[PDB]
Amino acid sequence: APIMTQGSLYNDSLSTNDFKSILLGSTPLDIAPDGAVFQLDRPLSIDYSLGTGDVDRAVYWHLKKFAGNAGTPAGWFRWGIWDNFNKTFTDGVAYYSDEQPRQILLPVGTVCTRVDS
Amino acid sequence: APIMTQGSLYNDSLSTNDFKSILLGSTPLDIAPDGAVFQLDRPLSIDYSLGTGDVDRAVYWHLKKFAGNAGTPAGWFRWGIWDNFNKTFTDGVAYYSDEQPRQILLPVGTVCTRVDS
Amino acid sequence: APIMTQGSLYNDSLSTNDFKSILLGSTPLDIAPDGAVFQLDRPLSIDYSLGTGDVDRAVYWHLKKFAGNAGTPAGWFRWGIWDNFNKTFTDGVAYYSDEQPRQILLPVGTVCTRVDS
Ligand SMILES: [Ca+2]
Ligand SMILES: [Ca+2]
Structure with missing residues (x-):
């Protein structure tokens, strides 16, 4: 039972600190209990800002x-x-939304593996 | 059959909006039908600039x-x-070429999966 | 025997051009001889600076x-x-250490493949 996303996560769908599970199109993720932690097999890049409206990038x-x-x-x-x-x-x-081009941050088929107990 | 790249894609080989297929060293890619769309198993990072010569990065x-x-x-x-x-x-x-260090954006062995049709 | 990392590489553990092998928690990597080269199945993002105040990212x-x-x-x-x-x-x-948020650059389970002969 390998959990794979079925919907793309776009940068324009992020809130400041989270995104809605529904976007990933995965029932296993949607029904995962509070506090469940998953590791991704693909990097999730998050643009952030330390000030001055400047964008930097985290992984x-x-x-x-x-x-x-x-x-x-x-x-x-x-x-x-x-x-x-x-x-x-x-x-x-926190994610910083400015004028970045639209991007798929996590594409369809991203594998998510539960890592907490 | 899985399509894997056989040559590295370097940042200094990008034009503003494309790169040449030959660089990836793959016959299946070289002869893929016009308009075929592939998903990669590795992110392609594209540096861009919205102004002032400042570089930001898209995936x-x-x-x-x-x-x-x-x-x-x-x-x-x-x-x-x-x-x-x-x-x-x-x-x-568009890719913005300035003073970035040379980088392999997609290494040998990147898997390309046709997703259109 | 695929070689997988067993410890996370954090950005705060990087020196200017290297990091300690032991951090990856892998005996095969630790005993790898001087000059051994590995390809990763995951991108290693390295922040750098042009020297005018800003952090950019290389892969x-x-x-x-x-x-x-x-x-x-x-x-x-x-x-x-x-x-x-x-x-x-x-x-x-060279890695540029400034005020970036703490990040896992390479997570546990990163696959390292020896590529030098
Ligand atoms: Ca910046
Ligand atoms: Ca910049």
Whole structure:
């Protein structure tokens, strides 16, 4: 049971710190419990800004599930860092939306592997 | 049969909006039908600039074949976005060549999967 | 025997042109001889600067082993470019450490393939 995305994640679909699970088109991700952490087999690049409206670029390989509700049953994911030794997830930097060209950050077929207990 | 690149794509080989197919060293790519779209298993990073000579970086996962001519018999690829729902390809941002270090953007062994039709 | 990393490479562990082999948590990598070159199945993103105040990003797919000393017995890897035709390795750009968010550049499970002869 390898979990693969079935929908593309576009940069214009990111909120400041998360995105909706539904975008990835994966029932396993949609039903994953709160706090589940996944490692991606493809990098998730996140443009950020340290100030002055300037864009810089970060890379993340891990997503943490935030359980949904009636309006958004599939919930959300935050990108960040999974420490496999200490078993900790740390949220990544906020996404900065400016004038970047539209991009598929994670394409269809991205493999997601649960890494927490 | 899986199509793998046999030659590295270097950043200093990109034109503003394409690169020559021959660079990838793949006969299946060289003779792919005009307009064929491929998804990559590795990100293609394209440096761009929206102004002031400032470089930012975009990611692409899709290439569209442009048929050759007598001068370039194997033709070209453009990078861009494949919409697998609406079955459309949109060319990506222009590559901005300035003072970046030389880089292999796509190494030997990159897997290319046809996704159109 | 595919070689997979067992520890994450964090951006805050990079020196200007190398990092300690031991960080990747792999005995095969640790014992690899001076001069061994590996290709990665995942991009290694290296932030650099042109020197006017801004962080840009380069991509590398190759590492070369450099023999260590009493303080770092397993030695170091440098990122760079492997030319598979001419059998040459060229060191990549200096890493620029500024105020970037902490990032896993290469996660656990990155596959390293020896490519020098
Ligand atoms: Ca910047
Ligand atoms: Ca810049």
